[PDB]
Enzyme design. Structure first.
Site, PDB file in Angstrom:
ATOM      1  N   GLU A  71       0.879  -1.197   0.000  1.00 19.10           N
ATOM      2  CA  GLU A  71       0.000   0.000   0.000  1.00 19.10           C
ATOM      3  C   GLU A  71       0.896   1.220   0.000  1.00 19.10           C
ATOM      4  O   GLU A  71       0.678   2.121  -0.758  1.00 19.10           O
ATOM      5  CB  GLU A  71      -0.881   0.003   1.249  1.00 19.10           C
ATOM      6  CG  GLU A  71      -2.092  -0.981   1.165  1.00 19.10           C
ATOM      7  CD  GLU A  71      -3.150  -0.583   0.108  1.00 19.10           C
ATOM      8  OE1 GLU A  71      -2.999   0.442  -0.581  1.00 19.10           O
ATOM      9  OE2 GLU A  71      -4.163  -1.278  -0.032  1.00 19.10           O
TER      10      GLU A  71
ATOM     11  N   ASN B 227      -7.033   9.582  -5.184  1.00 13.83           N
ATOM     12  CA  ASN B 227      -7.875   8.728  -6.041  1.00 13.83           C
ATOM     13  C   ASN B 227      -8.617   9.521  -7.099  1.00 13.83           C
ATOM     14  O   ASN B 227      -8.799  10.741  -6.985  1.00 13.83           O
ATOM     15  CB  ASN B 227      -8.843   7.875  -5.215  1.00 13.83           C
ATOM     16  CG  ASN B 227      -8.113   6.976  -4.235  1.00 13.83           C
ATOM     17  OD1 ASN B 227      -7.373   6.064  -4.642  1.00 13.83           O
ATOM     18  ND2 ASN B 227      -8.282   7.239  -2.943  1.00 13.83           N
TER      19      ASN B 227
ATOM     20  N   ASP C 228     -11.539   9.682  -7.745  1.00 16.34           N
ATOM     21  CA  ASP C 228     -12.822  10.155  -7.245  1.00 16.34           C
ATOM     22  C   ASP C 228     -12.620  11.338  -6.313  1.00 16.34           C
ATOM     23  O   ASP C 228     -13.554  11.755  -5.629  1.00 16.34           O
ATOM     24  CB  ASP C 228     -13.597   9.012  -6.536  1.00 16.34           C
ATOM     25  CG  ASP C 228     -13.086   8.729  -5.093  1.00 16.34           C
ATOM     26  OD1 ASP C 228     -11.891   8.911  -4.824  1.00 16.34           O
ATOM     27  OD2 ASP C 228     -13.879   8.320  -4.220  1.00 16.34           O
TER      28      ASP C 228
ATOM     29  N   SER D  53     -10.994  11.502  -3.523  1.00 20.41           N
ATOM     30  CA  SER D  53     -10.600  11.162  -2.159  1.00 20.41           C
ATOM     31  C   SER D  53      -9.076  10.883  -2.165  1.00 20.41           C
ATOM     32  O   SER D  53      -8.467  10.744  -3.226  1.00 20.41           O
ATOM     33  CB  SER D  53     -11.375   9.979  -1.596  1.00 20.41           C
ATOM     34  OG  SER D  53     -11.163   8.870  -2.425  1.00 20.41           O
TER      35      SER D  53
ATOM     36  N   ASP E  54      -5.831   8.569  -0.216  1.00 21.23           N
ATOM     37  CA  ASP E  54      -5.366   7.491   0.689  1.00 21.23           C
ATOM     38  C   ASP E  54      -4.180   7.935   1.519  1.00 21.23           C
ATOM     39  O   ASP E  54      -3.278   8.592   0.984  1.00 21.23           O
ATOM     40  CB  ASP E  54      -4.941   6.282  -0.097  1.00 21.23           C
ATOM     41  CG  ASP E  54      -6.101   5.590  -0.821  1.00 21.23           C
ATOM     42  OD1 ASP E  54      -7.298   5.749  -0.454  1.00 21.23           O
ATOM     43  OD2 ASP E  54      -5.802   4.853  -1.780  1.00 21.23           O
TER      44      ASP E  54
ATOM     45  N   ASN F 260      -8.529   5.727   3.395  1.00 22.99           N
ATOM     46  CA  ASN F 260      -9.177   6.605   2.445  1.00 22.99           C
ATOM     47  C   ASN F 260     -10.051   7.659   3.117  1.00 22.99           C
ATOM     48  O   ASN F 260     -10.697   7.390   4.157  1.00 22.99           O
ATOM     49  CB  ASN F 260      -9.970   5.739   1.465  1.00 22.99           C
ATOM     50  CG  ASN F 260     -10.480   6.515   0.299  1.00 22.99           C
ATOM     51  OD1 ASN F 260      -9.837   6.626  -0.735  1.00 22.99           O
ATOM     52  ND2 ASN F 260     -11.664   7.029   0.438  1.00 22.99           N
TER      53      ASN F 260
END
Ligand code: NA
Ligand SMILES: [Pt+2]
Ligand SMILES: [Pt+2]
Ligand SMILES: [Pt+2]
Ligand SMILES: [Pt+2]
Ligand SMILES: [Pt+2]
EC number: 3.2.1.17
Length: 129
Positions: A35, A46, A48, A50, A52, A59
């Protein structure tokens, strides 16, 4: 802080991740490897909108507040920047809530795609716990 493999494993156990909801410690370490490459400061935006955050790339849509994720929740009741500290308590505590939310560690895409079903014990082999 970029954790060493065995160093993160040590700290993950201490904070209660070993067999948390049935997930052996090797799974949490493999997920963190893929990750964030074990870096508490890793961020990844992201598509969208958002973001991480941290060693397990938690998130902002559900779990933390960064003040720029429209129509988002702060289910872990923290500022996302807490997830970037060299102390992983916040990341761990928020992960316990994620992994209980019902899709288990499948909520970590890198975990489903790269750790799930593999020899996860390798990630802890050689360490002191
Ligand atoms: Na949020
Ligand atoms: Pt803890
Ligand atoms: Pt296992
Ligand atoms: Pt927000
Ligand atoms: Pt710690
Ligand atoms: Pt080691």
């Amino acid at each position: 802080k970029v954790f060493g493999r065995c160093e993160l494993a040590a700290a993950m156990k201490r904070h209660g991740l070993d067999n948390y909801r049935g997930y052996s410690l090797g799974n949490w370490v493999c997920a963190a490897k893929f990750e964030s490459n074990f870096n508490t400061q890793a961020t990844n935006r992201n598509t969208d909108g958002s973001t991480d955050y941290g060693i397990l790339q938690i998130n902002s849509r559900w779990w933390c507040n960064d003040g720029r994720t429209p129509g988002s929740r702060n289910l872990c009741n923290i500022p996302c920047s807490a997830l970037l500290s060299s102390d992983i308590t916040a990341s761990v505590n928020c992960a316990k809530k994620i992994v209980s939310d019902g899709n288990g560690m499948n909520a970590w895409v890198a975990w489903r795609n790269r750790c799930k079903g593999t020899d996860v014990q390798a990630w802890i082999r050689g360490c002191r716990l």
